[PDB]
Design an enzyme around this catalytic site. Structure first.
Site: not given
Lengths: 216, 215
Positions: A15, A90, A169
């Protein structure tokens, strides 16, 4: 005017190429939660101290500590026209915290690239362990397969680059992100923010296009 | 005003005294990488410039690093001084600084024997997916070879094994040796104060001597 954005996307989806584009195009800096905090501790700022004290003791960093940096980071003069938040908040309380500290985001953009894509991308990464110099079999090959371009020593595929590890992950990110998607998707539905999803497998020039189109 | 260079093998934990000094003496730790990564993300004229090199698959050049440090140390927090960690790594970089009139008051050489670093590294355990870092002697998980959080398996990173560590260290000293003579030569003239401390010793004990020295 001013321009504030949050940016989501998967570990390895790459990204950053669009963060740095948004950067150029809109002229707003990148703020990595991890870099901003690393910087502070090493610079010994009040907050770098406090964090570094918590860290030393092996404890968990309070969120009040984090929004402050960001309150100081956006208090930098380079943020005048706005900024870009990379992979932050987050958590929901972090979403809430931003708001409760005067940070209300214009756009929430999500760079999605199928898990399956990312794994094959990580899989191409090589490295040389004694020097930590990296390689990718496509995006930047060594001049010779398997060998380090400097020492002629053989290459390895890092373990963390391998499917098992990348897959683990990936599940956490998804597991963690979904409510934010849900949270801001809720903000956006109520016009509170604009939520935008982009196909990150389209060529950069293409994704960069649609991105600009939206942010009119 | 007191300006300082830290020299130290990777993993010998020189970073540990670099923080002591900052705490004890109030000068920032300056890491080129970090400083570089931040200009890029902030997109400074130089950060912009440097970012271009990377995408081209090239190395960032001296003038750019030197121009970043120049920028760094002119900042407010550096008036009373700063600590350079991970720079210079060449003589031309070394000469680069001196040109700009960097007034290093001390060069500090942090030393742990290879074999001691090996054993140090030999104890690190990683949970691969998060990059969280346990350590059997200094910082163990709740559960042996197990990740406290996930309850996952800790691995012995291939990166931390002896063949590589000594490989890495081997390279480390060949590169560093010429800076040592360089600063050995400078100290000989008197242009800085050369210091050396055994890092095999315990930390608070090491930090102690450093302070005495910089008194």
């Amino acid at each position: 005017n001013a321009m504030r954005i949050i940016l989501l996307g998967a570990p390895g989806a790459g990204k950053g190429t669009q963060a740095q584009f948004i950067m150029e195009k809109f002229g707003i800096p990148q703020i990595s939660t991890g870099d901003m905090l690393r910087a502070a501790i090493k610079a010994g700022t009040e907050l770098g101290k406090q964090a570094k004290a918590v860290i030393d003791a092996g404890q968990l960093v309070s969120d009040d500590i984090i929004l402050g940096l960001i309150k100081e980071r956006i208090a930098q003069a380079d943020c005048e026209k706005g900024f870009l938040l990379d992979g932050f908040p987050r958590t929901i309380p972090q979403a809430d915290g931003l708001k409760e500290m005067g940070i209300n985001v214009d756009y929430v953009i999500e760079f999605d690239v199928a898990d399956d894509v990312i794994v094959e991308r990580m899989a191409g990464r090589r490295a040389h362990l004694p020097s930590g110099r990296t390689y990718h079999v496509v995006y930047n090959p060594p001049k010779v397969e398997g060998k380090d371009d400097v020492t002629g020593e053989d290459l390895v595929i890092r373990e963390d680059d391998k499917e098992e590890t990348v897959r683990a992950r990936l599940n956490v990110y998804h597991t963690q992100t979904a409510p934010l998607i849900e949270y801001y998707g809720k903000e956006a539905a109520a016009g509170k923010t604009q939520y935008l999803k982009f196909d990150g497998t389209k060529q950069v020039s293409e994704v960069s296009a649609d991105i600009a189109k939206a942010l009119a």
